[PDB]
Amino acid sequence: RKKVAVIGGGLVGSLQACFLAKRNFQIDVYEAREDTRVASINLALSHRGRQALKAVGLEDQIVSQGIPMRARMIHSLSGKKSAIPYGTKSQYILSVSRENLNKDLLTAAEKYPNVKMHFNHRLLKCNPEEGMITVLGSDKVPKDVTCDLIVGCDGAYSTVRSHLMKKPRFDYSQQYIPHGYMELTIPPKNGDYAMEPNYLHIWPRNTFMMIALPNMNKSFTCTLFMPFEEFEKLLTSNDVVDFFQKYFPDAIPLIGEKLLVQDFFLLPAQPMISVKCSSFHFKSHCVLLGDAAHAIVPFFGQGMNAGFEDCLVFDELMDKFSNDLSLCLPVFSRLRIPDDSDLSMYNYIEMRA
Numbered sequence: 001r002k003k004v005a006v007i008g009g010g011l012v013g014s015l016q017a018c019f020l021a022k023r024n025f026q027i028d029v030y031e032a033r034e035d036t037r038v039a040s041i042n043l044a045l046s047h048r049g050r051q052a053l054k055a056v057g058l059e060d061q062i063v064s065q066g067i068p069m070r071a072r073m074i075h076s077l078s079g080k081k082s083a084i085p086y087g088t089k090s091q092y093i094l095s096v097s098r099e100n101l102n103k104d105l106l107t108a109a110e111k112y113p114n115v116k117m118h119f120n121h122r123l124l125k126c127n128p129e130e131g132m133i134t135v136l137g138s139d140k141v142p143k144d145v146t147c148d149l150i151v152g153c154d155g156a157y158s159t160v161r162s163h164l165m166k167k168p169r170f171d172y173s174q175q176y177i178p179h180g181y182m183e184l185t186i187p188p189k190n191g192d193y194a195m196e197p198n199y200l201h202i203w204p205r206n207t208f209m210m211i212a213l214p215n216m217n218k219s220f221t222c223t224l225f226m227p228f229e230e231f232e233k234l235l236t237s238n239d240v241v242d243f244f245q246k247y248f249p250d251a252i253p254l255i256g257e258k259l260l261v262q263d264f265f266l267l268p269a270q271p272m273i274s275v276k277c278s279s280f281h282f283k284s285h286c287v288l289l290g291d292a293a294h295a296i297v298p299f300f301g302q303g304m305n306a307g308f309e310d311c312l313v314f315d316e317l318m319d320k321f322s323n324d325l326s327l328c329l330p331v332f333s334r335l336r337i338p339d340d341s342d343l344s345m346y347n348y349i350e351m352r353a
């Protein structure tokens with residue numbers, strides 16, 4: 001039995017646990033955060049992402065909890081709506097709860113005898129060549145443990161990644177992009193959806209935009225993507241309401257003015273990083289999946305779905321190369337990296353037609 005340390009019990013980490021569990025590895029997952037089953041909110045799941053769940057027999061489980069989006073609904077500056085179908089049926093996407101997907105994936109990974117969950121454990125440091133990691137439980141005693149394979153599934157700020165990268169003469173490397181994001185809610189109207197549920201709703205503007213995905217509880221979660229330069233200018237409730245009157249006129253009625261002003265100032269806008277690694281593996285000891293390998297901002301694509309495909313492709317290599325990691329890893333890097341727009345920046349011009 002070969003020993004695997006999966007760093008990160010998020011979306012990709014939990015998925016990968018299931019894939020590896022099928023291959024009779026000894027898998028220990030280490031999640032810094034607490035078990036969410038005791039203790040953004042939406043995502044669009046794609047056809048490609050589905051395939052990965054199906055490969056571990058979770059699809060129908062997760063699909064039943066999801067609301068299908070079969071077209072875009074565009075909200076123009078004037079507050080008018082227009083529908084745009086997806087070309088192919090395979091472009092349909094599914095709105096799913098982030099939290100509950102993570103819950104389901106974790107339970108699925110525990111259904112396996114050879115999987116043990118280690119919550120409230122934060123990788124402080126690791127050694128790739130040495131196959132050793134340094135974790136930290138709540139008891140707060142740095143204990144070091146060895147392993148055969150380290151799977152960096154520890155998200156956009158991967159600690160595993162920080163150890164696999166070299167560190168040049170003068171680090172002229174910006175981490176964050178100039179855009180930030182903020183979540184709002186369109187609540188139900190009369191115990192039902194305040195707009196058309198089976199659409200991805202989009203308020204495209206040039207340098208900023210909002211999107212809305214439906215929830216099972218008959219609300220929509222909004223996400224507003226804006227340069228910090230713009231967020232900076234919205235200091236008061238009056239500023240916010242003014243901004244929304246001017247750029248998202250139909251949104252205020254849907255969200256409600258009070259609710260908007262409350263939720264807008266719960267937190268600063270959340271920053272985002274755009275990174276890609278030259279390689280997703282070290283030797284035969286360490287591989288990166290999900291945002292650890294490629295942190296994809298939503299403007300340029302679909303991070304979860306990409307990470308889920310990471311798992312699928314990795315699993316296909318394992319079949320292909322009979323669990324030989326010396327081969328799977330390097331080939332994984334080579335085959336994934338070359339896998340490269342609903343949320344692009346544009347003005348939407350209303351025509352007479």
Ligand SMILES: Cc1cc2nc3c(=O)[nH]c(=O)nc-3n(C[C@H](O)[C@H](O)[C@H](O)COP(=O)(O)OP(=O)(O)OC[C@H]3O[C@@H](n4cnc5c(N)ncnc54)[C@H](O)[C@@H]3O)c2cc1C
Pocket residue numbers: 007008009010011012013030031032033040042043044045121122123124153154155156157158159181223272289290291292296298301302303304305306307
């Ligand atoms: C606003 C927004 C909207 C998005 N919408 C979509 C969408 O619609 N569709 C889509 O496909 N993608 C979407 N994405 C991308 C998607 O959220 C990510 O790409 C995806 O969650 C990556 O999954 P992951 O497992 O790699 O990382 P994560 O989900 O971030 O999980 C990483 C885990 O590692 C843990 N961890 C971190 N450091 C340590 C450490 N040192 N020790 C131990 N554990 C650690 C964290 O606690 C976390 O549980 C969106 C992203 C953003 C920011």
